[PDB]
Amino acid sequence: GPLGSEDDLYRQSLEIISRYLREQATGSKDSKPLGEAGAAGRRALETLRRVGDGVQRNHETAFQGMLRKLDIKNEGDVKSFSRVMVHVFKDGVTNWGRIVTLISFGAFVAKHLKSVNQESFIEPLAETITDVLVRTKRDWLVKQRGWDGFVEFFHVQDLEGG
């Protein structure tokens, strides 16, 4: 049925986004590792976790001004996320770092939404951030084998080049 000409990545992009945003919102480290998303999720949830911890420390100024400018009240405030969706890739040249900031913002905003006890809008929050993530950078995701590519860019563990 679903399997065919539909979207295979989206399924994953969601599996990992949920897994990531869920572990972030709670703040507690997940004990159960990946086992459905495949290879991407395994190295993604761990990579994204690290890049996120850094992104937040690197954007604390931006993140503070971005979320402060917004104000999640209902599922309608998600429109504000759409604004940052574009503002994230403001630069003509597309870089994984930019896409990392997008996932980094909503991920940080999700944990923020949970800090105020509004998980109600969180469920749709994650569903949107993901949709808008793979659906906004689909062409790229298709031109860069999506998920696998993301990790291809971050195939570095304890090594640094440039």
mmCIF file of C-alpha atoms in Angstrom:
data_model
loop_
_atom_site.group_PDB
_atom_site.id
_atom_site.type_symbol
_atom_site.label_atom_id
_atom_site.label_comp_id
_atom_site.label_asym_id
_atom_site.label_seq_id
_atom_site.Cartn_x
_atom_site.Cartn_y
_atom_site.Cartn_z
ATOM 1 C CA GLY A 1 0.000 0.000 0.000
ATOM 2 C CA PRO A 2 2.026 2.991 1.306
ATOM 3 C CA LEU A 3 5.300 1.518 0.049
ATOM 4 C CA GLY A 4 5.835 2.639 -3.534
ATOM 5 C CA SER A 5 6.236 6.118 -5.004
ATOM 6 C CA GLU A 6 5.458 7.809 -1.685
ATOM 7 C CA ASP A 7 8.064 9.158 0.743
ATOM 8 C CA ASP A 8 10.396 6.695 2.466
ATOM 9 C CA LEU A 9 12.626 9.246 4.200
ATOM 10 C CA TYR A 10 9.726 11.181 5.749
ATOM 11 C CA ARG A 11 8.913 8.025 7.712
ATOM 12 C CA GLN A 12 12.435 8.058 9.122
ATOM 13 C CA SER A 13 12.834 11.842 9.375
ATOM 14 C CA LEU A 14 9.818 11.544 11.686
ATOM 15 C CA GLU A 15 10.959 8.463 13.598
ATOM 16 C CA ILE A 16 14.225 10.182 14.510
ATOM 17 C CA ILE A 17 12.715 13.630 15.032
ATOM 18 C CA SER A 18 10.216 12.162 17.478
ATOM 19 C CA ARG A 19 12.907 10.073 19.156
ATOM 20 C CA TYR A 20 15.174 13.124 19.369
ATOM 21 C CA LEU A 21 12.612 15.733 20.443
ATOM 22 C CA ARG A 22 11.135 13.239 22.916
ATOM 23 C CA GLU A 23 14.468 12.569 24.624
ATOM 24 C CA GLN A 24 15.186 16.306 24.622
ATOM 25 C CA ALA A 25 11.842 17.459 26.028
ATOM 26 C CA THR A 26 12.106 14.992 28.912
ATOM 27 C CA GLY A 27 15.771 15.782 29.474
ATOM 28 C CA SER A 28 16.512 12.178 30.413
ATOM 29 C CA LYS A 29 18.829 10.035 28.290
ATOM 30 C CA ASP A 30 17.031 7.246 26.429
ATOM 31 C CA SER A 31 18.069 3.737 27.461
ATOM 32 C CA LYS A 32 16.695 2.014 24.361
ATOM 33 C CA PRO A 33 18.750 2.590 21.168
ATOM 34 C CA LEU A 34 17.496 2.822 17.583
ATOM 35 C CA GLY A 35 15.995 -0.230 15.904
ATOM 36 C CA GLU A 36 13.570 0.934 13.222
ATOM 37 C CA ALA A 37 14.877 4.116 11.606
ATOM 38 C CA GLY A 38 17.789 2.014 10.404
ATOM 39 C CA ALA A 39 21.337 3.361 10.238
ATOM 40 C CA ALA A 40 20.578 7.092 10.048
ATOM 41 C CA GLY A 41 18.655 7.216 13.300
ATOM 42 C CA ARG A 42 21.365 5.300 15.131
ATOM 43 C CA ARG A 43 24.051 7.871 14.321
ATOM 44 C CA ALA A 44 21.530 10.702 13.905
ATOM 45 C CA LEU A 45 19.912 10.734 17.335
ATOM 46 C CA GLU A 46 23.430 10.657 18.789
ATOM 47 C CA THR A 47 24.863 13.184 16.357
ATOM 48 C CA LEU A 48 21.885 15.545 16.523
ATOM 49 C CA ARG A 49 22.065 15.260 20.305
ATOM 50 C CA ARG A 50 25.650 16.525 20.295
ATOM 51 C CA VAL A 51 25.263 19.138 17.539
ATOM 52 C CA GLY A 52 22.189 20.335 19.388
ATOM 53 C CA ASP A 53 23.945 20.759 22.712
ATOM 54 C CA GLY A 54 26.507 22.810 20.848
ATOM 55 C CA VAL A 55 24.089 24.677 18.587
ATOM 56 C CA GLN A 56 22.217 25.815 21.691
ATOM 57 C CA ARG A 57 25.456 27.054 23.248
ATOM 58 C CA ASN A 58 26.315 28.683 19.924
ATOM 59 C CA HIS A 59 22.872 30.192 19.425
ATOM 60 C CA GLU A 60 21.972 30.961 23.046
ATOM 61 C CA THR A 61 21.889 34.567 21.827
ATOM 62 C CA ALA A 62 19.935 33.763 18.659
ATOM 63 C CA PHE A 63 17.774 31.086 20.292
ATOM 64 C CA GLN A 64 16.908 33.571 23.037
ATOM 65 C CA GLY A 65 15.839 36.249 20.581
ATOM 66 C CA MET A 66 14.102 33.831 18.220
ATOM 67 C CA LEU A 67 11.817 32.130 20.742
ATOM 68 C CA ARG A 68 11.319 35.366 22.690
ATOM 69 C CA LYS A 69 9.997 36.937 19.494
ATOM 70 C CA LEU A 70 7.509 34.074 19.264
ATOM 71 C CA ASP A 71 4.936 32.886 21.806
ATOM 72 C CA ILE A 72 3.422 29.414 21.519
ATOM 73 C CA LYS A 73 -0.183 29.587 22.714
ATOM 74 C CA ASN A 74 -1.870 26.987 20.536
ATOM 75 C CA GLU A 75 -1.321 24.835 17.447
ATOM 76 C CA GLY A 76 -1.729 28.084 15.548
ATOM 77 C CA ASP A 77 1.546 29.513 16.827
ATOM 78 C CA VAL A 78 3.232 26.905 14.640
ATOM 79 C CA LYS A 79 2.907 29.494 11.881
ATOM 80 C CA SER A 80 5.679 31.359 13.682
ATOM 81 C CA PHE A 81 7.903 28.327 13.200
ATOM 82 C CA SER A 82 7.273 28.580 9.467
ATOM 83 C CA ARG A 83 8.793 32.061 9.637
ATOM 84 C CA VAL A 84 12.010 30.758 11.183
ATOM 85 C CA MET A 85 11.820 27.819 8.782
ATOM 86 C CA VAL A 86 12.734 30.207 5.996
ATOM 87 C CA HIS A 87 14.840 32.589 8.082
ATOM 88 C CA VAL A 88 17.064 29.594 8.856
ATOM 89 C CA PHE A 89 17.975 29.041 5.202
ATOM 90 C CA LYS A 90 18.176 32.785 4.543
ATOM 91 C CA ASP A 91 21.462 32.202 2.712
ATOM 92 C CA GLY A 92 21.258 31.184 -0.935
ATOM 93 C CA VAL A 93 23.803 28.400 -0.526
ATOM 94 C CA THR A 94 22.363 25.336 1.208
ATOM 95 C CA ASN A 95 24.527 23.808 3.934
ATOM 96 C CA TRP A 96 23.896 20.924 6.332
ATOM 97 C CA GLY A 97 24.763 23.334 9.116
ATOM 98 C CA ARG A 98 21.741 25.435 8.195
ATOM 99 C CA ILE A 99 19.420 22.427 8.194
ATOM 100 C CA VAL A 100 20.987 21.533 11.533
ATOM 101 C CA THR A 101 19.920 24.911 12.918
ATOM 102 C CA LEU A 102 16.347 24.310 11.785
ATOM 103 C CA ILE A 103 16.095 20.985 13.574
ATOM 104 C CA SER A 104 18.078 22.575 16.403
ATOM 105 C CA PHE A 105 15.574 25.408 16.858
ATOM 106 C CA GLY A 106 12.396 23.350 16.938
ATOM 107 C CA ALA A 107 14.168 20.766 19.066
ATOM 108 C CA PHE A 108 15.135 23.445 21.574
ATOM 109 C CA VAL A 109 11.667 24.966 21.297
ATOM 110 C CA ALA A 110 10.121 21.567 21.989
ATOM 111 C CA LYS A 111 12.105 21.235 25.207
ATOM 112 C CA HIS A 112 11.018 24.793 25.947
ATOM 113 C CA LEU A 113 7.378 23.938 25.296
ATOM 114 C CA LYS A 114 7.744 21.031 27.721
ATOM 115 C CA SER A 115 9.320 23.262 30.368
ATOM 116 C CA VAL A 116 6.034 25.176 30.488
ATOM 117 C CA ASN A 117 3.890 22.027 30.614
ATOM 118 C CA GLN A 118 2.309 22.427 27.180
ATOM 119 C CA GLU A 119 3.000 18.964 25.764
ATOM 120 C CA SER A 120 -0.480 19.351 24.270
ATOM 121 C CA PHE A 121 0.901 21.591 21.530
ATOM 122 C CA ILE A 122 4.166 19.654 21.574
ATOM 123 C CA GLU A 123 2.760 16.607 19.776
ATOM 124 C CA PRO A 124 1.717 18.719 16.749
ATOM 125 C CA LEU A 125 4.879 20.757 17.243
ATOM 126 C CA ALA A 126 7.200 17.866 16.442
ATOM 127 C CA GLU A 127 4.910 16.647 13.659
ATOM 128 C CA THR A 128 5.217 20.061 12.006
ATOM 129 C CA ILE A 129 8.947 20.653 12.529
ATOM 130 C CA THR A 130 9.634 17.309 10.832
ATOM 131 C CA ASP A 131 7.140 17.701 8.011
ATOM 132 C CA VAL A 132 8.433 21.138 7.306
ATOM 133 C CA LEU A 133 11.991 19.825 7.613
ATOM 134 C CA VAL A 134 11.933 16.991 5.059
ATOM 135 C CA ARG A 135 9.210 18.651 2.995
ATOM 136 C CA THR A 136 11.133 21.948 2.811
ATOM 137 C CA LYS A 137 14.492 20.384 1.970
ATOM 138 C CA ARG A 138 13.145 17.445 -0.032
ATOM 139 C CA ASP A 139 14.974 18.344 -3.256
ATOM 140 C CA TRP A 140 18.200 18.454 -1.263
ATOM 141 C CA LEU A 141 17.225 15.280 0.573
ATOM 142 C CA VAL A 142 16.740 13.653 -2.832
ATOM 143 C CA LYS A 143 19.916 15.151 -4.291
ATOM 144 C CA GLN A 144 21.914 14.121 -1.215
ATOM 145 C CA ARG A 145 20.332 10.724 -0.492
ATOM 146 C CA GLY A 146 18.772 12.471 2.500
ATOM 147 C CA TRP A 147 19.437 10.944 5.917
ATOM 148 C CA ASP A 148 22.621 9.083 4.937
ATOM 149 C CA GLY A 149 24.012 12.331 3.555
ATOM 150 C CA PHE A 150 23.363 14.221 6.783
ATOM 151 C CA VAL A 151 25.651 11.720 8.501
ATOM 152 C CA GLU A 152 28.041 11.744 5.536
ATOM 153 C CA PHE A 153 28.691 15.376 6.414
ATOM 154 C CA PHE A 154 29.140 14.371 10.041
ATOM 155 C CA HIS A 155 31.204 11.217 9.542
ATOM 156 C CA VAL A 156 33.711 12.681 11.997
ATOM 157 C CA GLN A 157 33.822 11.413 15.579
ATOM 158 C CA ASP A 158 37.030 12.566 17.263
ATOM 159 C CA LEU A 159 38.791 13.841 14.140
ATOM 160 C CA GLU A 160 38.890 17.397 12.796
ATOM 161 C CA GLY A 161 39.848 18.617 9.335
ATOM 162 C CA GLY A 162 38.160 21.783 8.134
#
